[PDB]
Amino acid sequence: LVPMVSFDIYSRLLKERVIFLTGQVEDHMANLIVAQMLFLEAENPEKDIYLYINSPGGVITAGMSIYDTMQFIKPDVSTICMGQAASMGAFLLTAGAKGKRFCLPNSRVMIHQPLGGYQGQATDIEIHAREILKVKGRMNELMALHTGQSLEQIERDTERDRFLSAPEAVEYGLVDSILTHRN
Amino acid sequence: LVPMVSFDIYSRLLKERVIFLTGQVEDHMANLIVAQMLFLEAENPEKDIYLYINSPGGVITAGMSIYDTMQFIKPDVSTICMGQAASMGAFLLTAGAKGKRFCLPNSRVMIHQPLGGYQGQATDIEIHAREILKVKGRMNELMALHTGQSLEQIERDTERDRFLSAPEAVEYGLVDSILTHRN
Amino acid sequence: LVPMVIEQTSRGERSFDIYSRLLKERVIFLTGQVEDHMANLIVAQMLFLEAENPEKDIYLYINSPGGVITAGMSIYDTMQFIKPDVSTICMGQAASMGAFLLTAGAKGKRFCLPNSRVMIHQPLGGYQGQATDIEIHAREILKVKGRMNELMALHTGQSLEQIERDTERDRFLSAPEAVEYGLVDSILTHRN
Amino acid sequence: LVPMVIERSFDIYSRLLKERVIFLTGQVEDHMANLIVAQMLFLEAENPEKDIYLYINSPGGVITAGMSIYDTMQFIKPDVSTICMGQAASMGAFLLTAGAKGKRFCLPNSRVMIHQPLGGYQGQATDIEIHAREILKVKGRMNELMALHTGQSLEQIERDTERDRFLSAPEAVEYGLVDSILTHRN
Amino acid sequence: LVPMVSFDIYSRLLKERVIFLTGQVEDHMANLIVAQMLFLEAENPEKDIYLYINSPGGVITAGMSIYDTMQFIKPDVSTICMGQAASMGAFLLTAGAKGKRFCLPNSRVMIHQPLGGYQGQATDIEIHAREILKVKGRMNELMALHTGQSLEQIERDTERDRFLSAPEAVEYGLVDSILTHRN
Amino acid sequence: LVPMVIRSFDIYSRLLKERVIFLTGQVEDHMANLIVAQMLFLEAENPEKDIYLYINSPGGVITAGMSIYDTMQFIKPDVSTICMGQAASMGAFLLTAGAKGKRFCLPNSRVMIHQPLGGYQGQATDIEIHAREILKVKGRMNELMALHTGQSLEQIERDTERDRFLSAPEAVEYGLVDSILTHRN
Amino acid sequence: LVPMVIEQERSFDIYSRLLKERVIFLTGQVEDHMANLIVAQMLFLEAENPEKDIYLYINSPGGVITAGMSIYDTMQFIKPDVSTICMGQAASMGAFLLTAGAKGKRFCLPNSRVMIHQPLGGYQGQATDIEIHAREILKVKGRMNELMALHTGQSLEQIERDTERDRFLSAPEAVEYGLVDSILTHRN
Amino acid sequence: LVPMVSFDIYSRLLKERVIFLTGQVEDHMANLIVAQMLFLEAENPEKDIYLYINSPGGVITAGMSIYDTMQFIKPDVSTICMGQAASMGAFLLTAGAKGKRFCLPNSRVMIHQPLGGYQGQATDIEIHAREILKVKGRMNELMALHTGQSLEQIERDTERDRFLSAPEAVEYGLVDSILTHRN
Amino acid sequence: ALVPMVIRSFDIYSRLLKERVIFLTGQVEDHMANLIVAQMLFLEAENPEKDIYLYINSPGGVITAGMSIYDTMQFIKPDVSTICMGQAASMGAFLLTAGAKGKRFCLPNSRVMIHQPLGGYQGQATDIEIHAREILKVKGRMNELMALHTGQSLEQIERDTERDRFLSAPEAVEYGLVDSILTHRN
Ligand SMILES: *C[C@](*)(O)[C@H](Cc1ccc(O)cc1)NC(=O)[C@H](CC(C)C)NC(=O)OCc1ccccc1
Ligand SMILES: *C[C@](*)(O)[C@H](Cc1ccc(O)cc1)NC(=O)[C@H](CC(C)C)NC(=O)OCc1ccccc1
Ligand SMILES: *C[C@](*)(O)[C@H](Cc1ccc(O)cc1)NC(=O)[C@H](CC(C)C)NC(=O)OCc1ccccc1
Ligand SMILES: *C[C@](*)(O)[C@H](Cc1ccc(O)cc1)NC(=O)[C@H](CC(C)C)NC(=O)OCc1ccccc1
Ligand SMILES: *C[C@](*)(O)[C@H](Cc1ccc(O)cc1)NC(=O)[C@H](CC(C)C)NC(=O)OCc1ccccc1
Ligand SMILES: *C[C@](*)(O)[C@H](Cc1ccc(O)cc1)NC(=O)[C@H](CC(C)C)NC(=O)OCc1ccccc1
Ligand SMILES: *C[C@](*)(O)[C@H](Cc1ccc(O)cc1)NC(=O)[C@H](CC(C)C)NC(=O)OCc1ccccc1
Ligand SMILES: *C[C@](*)(O)[C@H](Cc1ccc(O)cc1)NC(=O)[C@H](CC(C)C)NC(=O)OCc1ccccc1
Ligand SMILES: *C[C@](*)(O)[C@H](Cc1ccc(O)cc1)NC(=O)[C@H](CC(C)C)NC(=O)OCc1ccccc1
C-alpha cells in the first residue's frame, strides 16, 4: 500500500534528493539507502542529499555501510531526525555533514554501547568478546569525532541508554540545530 | 485490490491534496504520510492539504514524525476524523491547522496517557521510566496547546481512557467543527 | 527417583527419602532457582527443625543461580526469626538471591566450599502498562534494590556505597575472594 | 519403572546405596547433582571410614553442578572410588579423575573425553566482558585441577583440551585420568 | 502399568534372576539393567542371571555400560532374544556367556555399523569422524570375538543392515541354540 | 484409576491369581513385555494349570507380538485365548496361537486379518534390503497362520492381501478359533 | 484425588470400597482400556459370588463399538445378572450397554436422558479398501440394530428407522420404548 | 521497497557497472550476481565491474560459482567491502582483481575455516568428512594465492575466527587499499 | 525476490536468454524444470541451429523432474552445452554429463558428486515390493545413461554410485563426466 505519482511516492521524493531511513537498520534496507546515495551522487555529484532518519537502532555493520557511504560520496549528506534516532539511528544522524544535521522539534535521540551475543568454546568466546570491545571503542571514537565531546565523556554517557530531547541533542553536539518551519 | 483511474484510487485523490491516515500508527505507514505531505508541499506550498484520520492509536515516535512534518511544511494541514481517532490518532487530529480540524458526525474520539513496557536491571528500569514520564508530560503540553484546555485539565482527563463524541470533541477544543454535508 | 533409606524407629523400621534422612543431620538443601514453592519447602524444614530442637544449629547447603526476591525473603526472614543458628555452606555456586541467603547465615558459620563461586548483582524486573503504573512499579523495584543493598552491607560489613557500586553489574567472586569480601567467614576444605 | 526388593522394601538403587554404591548417570545439572551430594553425605554419616563407589556414565554437563559434587568428594571423610562405564565426557571425565588416588577405574570398553568450557551470553559489551572474563577464569581453574589429578603439566592439559579429545580406557590410564582398568570381579 | 502385590511383575521375576532389556538402549534404562545385575551378583555370585532382550538398538556408550557389567560380574549372564535384537540389542545378545545365548524360534536379529551425526568446524568434524570410525572398528572386533566370525566377515556383513532368522543367527554364531519348549 | 483388593492387589493383580491375563490395545514392546512377565510368573506358580489370555486389540508391532507368541509356545502351561471386542492383525494372530481346542471368540467379537505394513526411507540399496525383510516376515507370519488355522499357506496369503473381517462363527469356520463362548458353564 | 476409606484394616479408595457392594461405574467415553477395567471388575465379582447381582452405573456420551462389545459380551457371559442404572446420560454405546442389562433390572434415574443412533466411522484408502471397510460398518450397524431390537422388544424395522439420526429420550420415554424397565427415584 | 527511477534502483546502478552482494551467500542470490556479471561483460568486455560486498558469509559452493565467474569473465572485478566481509564474503573480497580490492574505512573483515554437518552411517560420515577437509585445503590454497600469505600462515590463522580492521585487512593482503573519499 | 531490469524492458534472465543462456540453479523439481524445458523449446524455435548454454549449480533433486530436462535436451535440435559452476550433485551431475559431446564444462573450482537414488514408501508389503521394484528399475536406467554419457562401463557406474562420490573438476574430466575445464573466456 504505497502511492504513486509513474514514480512511487518515494521515487518522487528521490527526485528532490530526499532518502528515507525508517525502522531497524539491517543489511538489505541499508543496501537500499547506499544505492540511493550512489544514484543521487551519479545524478549530481555536487548537490546536497537529504537523509531523514526515524529509527530505533539496529545492526552495527549494516549501519557502518551507510556511514562510510555518507563520508565517501561527493555530495554532503544532510541528516534530519523525525520521530526518533536511537543508537545506530543516533549514530548516522550525527554523521551528517557538519552544519547540516537537524532534529525536528519533538524528535528524540538515544545513545548506548553495543549489545551482542555469542555461544561456543571459551577460546571462541574470548575472540568474540575482544571483537565487540574493539567495535565499542571505534564507535565511541567516531561519536566523539562528530559530537565534539571527549572520548571519555562519550564512554561514560553510553554505558547505559541515554535519552535526549531535540534541544539536548543540539547542546550535546549530536545535531546542529532544530528545524522548525520551512524557510 | 486498489481500484485504478493512470493512477490507483489513493494516487488519484492525492491529486486532490487528500491523504489518508488509516489504522495503527507505526513507522512505515507514518513515513508514507510524511512523504505524501512533502510531495504535496512541493506541488503547491500555499494550497491546503487534507488529512483524513481513522485510527485506534499507535506508536508515539511514529506519530511525532507526522506531527512535526505537519507543523514544518508550508501548507496548512486540515484534519478530518472519520470512524475514530484514538490516542495518537486523536493527537494528530487536534494538531491540524487551527480552524480546519473536523469530525464527521458519528466519529468518536479517545484520549489517554502513554503505555509502555521495559524489562531489565533496576538502573535501566529507572532510565526508561523517566523517559516515558517525560514523554507523557510533553504530549500533555502539546495536547493543551492544541485544545486550549489547561495542562492540568488534560492531565486529569488522560489518566484513563476518555471517550468523546463529535459534539463533545468540538466542545473540548479537540476539533473546530463537524462536517455533516459537503458544499 | 529420589533414593530412600530404611531406619529403626522404636515403633518399627520406616522409610525416609534421601533428603528426609539428612534432615536428621539437621541438613536442608537449597538448589536451583529461588521461587515461592521451593522456598516454602525450605521455610517448612527450618520451622520443623526448630521445633525438634530450638538450640542446635541448622545447616543450609546452597547451590543456586538466583531467583525471586520475595521468595528469597520468605527464607531470609525465617532464618533470622527461628531460634537456632542457620549455618550456610555454598557448593557449586551462590548467585544473586543465592549469595544473599549465603551471606545471611549466622556470623562465623557461613562457608564456601573451595571451588564454589559467588556472584552478586542488582535486581532485574519488568513491567508493562500505563505510564502512571510504570512509575509505581519502578519506584517499588528501586525501594527493593536499596533495602537489599542495606542488608548485604549489614551482613558483609562493607559500606552501603561499596555494595551499591559493586552490584550495578554482575560481579563474580572465587571462594577466597568471598571470604575477603565478608560474604562468607571461611572456606571448608576437608571434613572438620 | 524401578525394580523393588522384598525382605521391608527397597527400590534397586536404595538397596545398592546400602552397599555404598552411587550412580551418576546422564547430563550433570543441579538437581541430579544434589542427589549425588546427598547420597555421599548420607554414606559419610553411616560410616566415615568405608570407601564409596561412584559409577559414572555421563556426556558431561554444567560446571557449577559438577563442582558441587567435586567439592563434596574432597570434603567428606571416605575415599570416593570412581568407576567409568559407557562414557565419562567433559564434566563426567573431570569427576572420574577426581576420585581417590589409586581408586579410579575405567571398565574395558568405556571411553573418556575431555574439552574446555562452552558457554553463551547476550547483553551489553560491558556485561559481555564480565562474563567472558569469568568463563576464562573457570577454564583456568578447571585446567589446574585436571593437571593436579592427572599428573599432566598445566600446559599439556590446556593444549589437550582446546578441542575435544577422546581416550580409550588404556589411553585414560596412560594419561593419568584413571589408575587402572577394571575387567573382572576379583 | 504393572501388576501389584510398588511390587510389580518385574520385581517378582527379579527374585528368580530374570532381567528384561526392552526397547531402545539409552543411559537410564541401561543403568537400571546394570543396577539389577550388580544386585543379583551381590545376592548370589555363583548363580546364572537371565537377560531377555527385545530391542531395536540404541546408544553405543549406554550399551557398553551393560556389556562391560555383563563381563565384569561373577555370575554368567545367559541371554534370550524375544521379538527382536537389532544392532545394540544383537550386540548384547551375542555378549552372553558362550553356550548360554538363545533365540526363541521366531525372534529376528539385525546387525549394522554405527550411525552418528556432528556439526561444527572441519577440524572438529575430523575429530568426531575419527572417533566414530574407531568405535566402529572396536565394535566389529568384539562382534567377531563373540560370534566366531572373522573381522573381515563382520565388516562386510555390517556395512548395511543385515537381518537374520533365529536359525541363521545360530548358524552365524551370534547365539548358541534356539529355545522352543521349556523342559 | 486401578481399583484394588485386600495383602493388597490391584484389579488385574487380583485376576492374576485366577491365572487370567489381559492383552488390551495396540501391541508394542513394553505392554508385550508385561504380558510375557505375567506368563512367566504364572508358569513358575504352577506349570500344569492353564493360563487365560483375553485379547481386545486393533493390532500392533510384529516383533513385539512375536515376543508374546514365542512365550506362549515356550512355557509349560497351555495358553487359552479369548477374544472380546476385537482381535485385529497382531491381535488375531495371538488369538489363533492359543492352545488347540482352547481358543475362543465371544459371540459379538470380530476378528480381522491382514498382511504386514511398513515403511522405509533411504538409498535404493537399503530399500531393497528392507523390502526383502518385510516380505520374509510376511511369509513367516503366513506359515504360522497356516499352522494354527489349518488353512494352506497360499490360501492365507491370498485372503490377507487386503483387510478381511470375520464374525465369531466365521472365525471358527476359518480355523482361527475353536469355539464361541456364550454363557459360563 | 480419589478419597481413601478404612474398613475395620485395609485402605480402599472410594471405588474399591463400592466394588465390595458389587457396584461398578461406567463413566465417560467407552474405549478399550476403561472397558477392560469394567470387564475385569465383572470377572472379579462373578469369581467372588456367581449368584449375586452386579450393579453397573452408566453415565456415558457413547464410544467405540468394539470396546463396548467387550463389555456387552462379558455382561451376557458371566453368571450374575448385571443390573444397569443410568445417571446423567447414556448415549449411543452407553444406551446400548444400558439396555443390555438383565431384563427387569435396567433403570433410569429420573432426570437421566438417553440417546440412540447408528454407527459413525471413517476411512481413507484405495476404492477396494473403501468397499471392504464400508461393508464392515454396514454389517456392524445391522448386528447392533438386531441386538437393540432384542433387548428393547421393538421390531428390527422400528429400531432401524429410529436410529437413522440421533434420537433423544427422557427417562419416561426410555421406559415406554423398552430401553429400561423402570425409573429409579428414592432408595428402598 | 525498491525506488523506481521504469528502472528500479539496482538496475539503475547496474548501468554504472555496479553489483551488490548483500547478506548470506546462497545459490539463488549468487546466481543473480553471476547473471549481472555475465550481462556487464556482454555490455562491455574491457570496463571494470564494481562488486560491493556486505556479507556475513555463506555456502561455499554458492560462493565458488561467483568466484569462478569473477575469474572467467573478461572485465576486472573490483571489490569494495562495506560494513563487513566475513568468511565467504572475505573470500570473494580478496578474489577481486589485484590492485582493485578495497575496504571502506570502518568496514570489518573476518576469516575462518569451513563449518558443516552430517548425519548417517559411519561409512558416510567418513566420505563427507574427507570432502570437507578437501574443501578446507582448497580454500586455504586460494586465500594464500590472493593474499600473498603462505599456505601454512593461512591454515594457522583460520583455525578459529579471525577479525581484521580495514587497515589490518590491507596489511594482511586481503585488500589492496582503503577507500575514504571519492576522488 | 529481486531481479534487475535491462532495456521495451527485460529482466536479467530474459536478457541472458537472448544470448541463448539458461540457468539451472538449486534443487531440481517439476516447476523449475518446466521453466528450463520451456526456455529450451523457445531457443530451438528462435534458432534450431545455434547452441544453447545451460549453467548448472545444483545439489540434486527429483528424478522424474530431471528426466523432463534430460529428454528435452536430447529432443531439441540445438546442441546443449553444459557448464558447471558451484556444484552439480546427483541429478545436477546427471544433467551436466548429458550435455552435447565435447561441449560439457566445469569451472575450475566447481565440484561434482554422484550417488544412487533415495526414496521412501509406506504401506502394505505388496505395495512396498512394487515400489522397491520401481526404484531399482530407475536406479539401473540412470546408471545405464550415466555409463553412456561418461564412457565408463555400467558396472563401474554401479560400483561408484553406491555411496556419495565427490569429484573435483580435474577428476570430473578424468571420469568422462565433462570434457574440459573452462578457465578464462576465449
Ligand atoms: C543499540 C544500537 O542500535 C547499537 C548501535 C551502536 C551505535 C553507536 C555506538 O557507539 C554503539 C552501538 N546497536 C547494536 O549494538 C546492535 C544490537 C542489535 C540487537 C542488533 N548490535 C550489534 O550489531 O552487534 C555488534 C557486534 C559487534 C562485534 C561482535 C558481536 C556483535
Ligand atoms: C494509546 C495512544 O495511541 C498513545 C499515544 C498518545 C497520544 C497522546 C498522549 O497524551 C499520550 C499518548 N500511544 C501509546 O502510548 C503507545 C502504545 C503502544 C504502541 C502499545 N505507546 C508508545 O508509543 O510508547 C512510547 C514510549 C515508550 C517508552 C518510553 C517512552 C515512550
Ligand atoms: C538476580 C538475583 O537472583 C536477584 C536477587 C537479588 C539479590 C540481592 C540483591 O541486592 C538484589 C537482587 N534476583 C532478581 O533480581 C530477580 C530475577 C527474576 C526472578 C528474573 N528479580 C526479582 O525478584 O524481581 C523483584 C521485583 C520486581 C518488581 C518490583 C519489585 C521487585
Ligand atoms: C563440556 C563439559 O561437560 C564441560 C565441563 C568441563 C570439564 C572440565 C574442564 O576442564 C572444563 C569444562 N561443560 C561445560 O563446558 C558446560 C557445557 C554446557 C552445559 C552446554 N558449560 C558450563 O557449565 O558453562 C560454564 C560457564 C562458566 C563461567 C561462565 C559461563 C559459563
Ligand atoms: C544401529 C545400532 O543400534 C548401533 C549399535 C551398534 C552395535 C554393534 C556394532 O558393531 C555397531 C553399532 N547403534 C548406533 O549406531 C547408535 C544409533 C543412534 C542411537 C541413533 N549410534 C551411536 O550410539 O553413535 C555413537 C557415536 C557417535 C559419534 C561418535 C562416536 C560414537
Ligand atoms: C496390521 C497387523 O497388526 C500386522 C501384524 C500381522 C499379523 C499377522 C500377519 O500375518 C501379518 C501381520 N501389523 C503390522 O503389519 C505392523 C503395523 C505397524 C505397527 C504400523 N507392522 C510391522 O510391525 O512392520 C514390521 C516390519 C517392518 C519392516 C520390515 C519387516 C517387518
Ligand atoms: C455413537 C455411538 O456411541 C455408537 C455406538 C452404537 C451403539 C448402538 C448402535 O446400534 C450403533 C452404534 N458409536 C459409534 O458409532 C462409534 C463412534 C465414535 C466416533 C468412536 N464408532 C465406532 O466405533 O466405529 C464404528 C465402526 C464399525 C465397523 C467398522 C468401522 C467403524
Ligand atoms: C564461515 C564462512 O562463511 C565459510 C566460507 C569459507 C571461506 C573461506 C575459507 O577459507 C573457508 C570457508 N562458510 C562455510 O563454512 C559454510 C557455512 C554454512 C553455510 C553454515 N559451509 C559450507 O558451505 O559447507 C562446507 C562443506 C564443504 C564440503 C562438504 C560439506 C560441507
Ligand atoms: C541424490 C540425487 O539427486 C538423485 C538423482 C540421481 C541421479 C543419477 C542417478 O544415477 C541416480 C539418482 N536424486 C534422488 O535420488 C531423488 C532424491 C529425493 C528428491 C530426496 N530421489 C528420487 O527422485 O526418487 C525417485 C524414485 C522414488 C521411488 C520410485 C522410483 C523413483
Curated annotation (Swiss-Prot), chains A, B, E, H:
Superkingdom of origin: Bacteria
Active site: S87, H112, D161
Disruption phenotype: Cells undergo an apoptotic-like death upon DNA damage characterized by membrane depolarization. Decreased persister cell formation upon antibiotic challenge probably due to increased levels of MazF toxin.
Effect of M4A: No ClpA-ClpP, little ClpX-ClpP complex forms
Reactions listed under catalytic activity: Hydrolysis of proteins to small peptides in the presence of ATP and magnesium. alpha-casein is the usual test substrate. In the absence of ATP, only oligopeptides shorter than five residues are hydrolyzed (such as succinyl-Leu-Tyr-|-NHMec, and Leu-Tyr-Leu-|-Tyr-Trp, in which cleavage of the -Tyr-|-Leu- and -Tyr-|-Trp bonds also occurs)
Effect caused by changing Y10A: No ClpA-ClpP or ClpX-ClpP complex forms
Activity regulation, per record: Inhibited by benzyloxycarbonyl leucyltyrosine chloromethylketone (Z-LY-CMK).
Induction: By heat shock. Part of the clpP-clpX operon.
Keyword Hydrolase recorded: yes
Single GO MF descriptor: ATP-dependent peptidase activity
Top enzyme category: hydrolase
Known function: Cleaves peptides in various proteins in a process that requires ATP hydrolysis. Has a chymotrypsin-like activity. Plays a major role in the degradation of misfolded proteins. May play the role of a master protease which is attracted to different substrates by different specificity factors such as ClpA or ClpX. Participates in the final steps of RseA-sigma-E degradation, liberating sigma-E to induce the extracytoplasmic-stress response. Degrades antitoxin MazE.
Homology family: Belongs to the peptidase S14 family.
More info: Acyldepsipeptide antibiotics bind in the ClpA or ClpX binding-sites, rendering the enzyme ATP-independent and indiscriminate, thus killing cells.
Protein's name according to its UniProt entry: ATP-dependent Clp protease proteolytic subunit
Taxonomic lineage of the native organism: Bacteria, Pseudomonadati, Pseudomonadota, Gammaproteobacteria, Enterobacterales
Swiss-Prot record, chain G:
Effect of loss of the gene: Cells undergo an apoptotic-like death upon DNA damage characterized by membrane depolarization. Decreased persister cell formation upon antibiotic challenge probably due to increased levels of MazF toxin.
Result when mutating Y15A: No ClpA-ClpP or ClpX-ClpP complex forms
Regulation of this protein's activity per its record: Inhibited by benzyloxycarbonyl leucyltyrosine chloromethylketone (Z-LY-CMK).
Effect noted on mutating V5A: No ClpA-ClpP or ClpX-ClpP complex forms
Enzyme Commission number, as recorded: 3.4.21.92
Active-site residues, Swiss-Prot/TrEMBL: S92 (nucleophile), H117, D166
This protein's UniProt keywords: Cytoplasm, Hydrolase, Protease, Serine protease, Stress response, Zymogen
Effect of I6A: No ClpA-ClpP or ClpX-ClpP complex forms
Pfam assignment, any one: CLP_protease
Domain notes: The N-terminus (residues 17-34) interact with ClpA and ClpX.
Quaternary state and interactors: Fourteen ClpP subunits assemble into 2 heptameric rings which stack back to back to give a disk-like structure with a central cavity, resembling the structure of eukaryotic proteasomes. Component of the ClpAP and ClpXP complexes.
PANTHER family for this protein: ATP-DEPENDENT CLP PROTEASE PROTEOLYTIC SUBUNIT (PTHR10381:SF70)
Remarks, miscellaneous: Acyldepsipeptide antibiotics bind in the ClpA or ClpX binding-sites, rendering the enzyme ATP-independent and indiscriminate, thus killing cells.
Family: Belongs to the peptidase S14 family.
Protein name in UniProt: ATP-dependent Clp protease proteolytic subunit
UniProt organism field: Escherichia coli (strain K12)
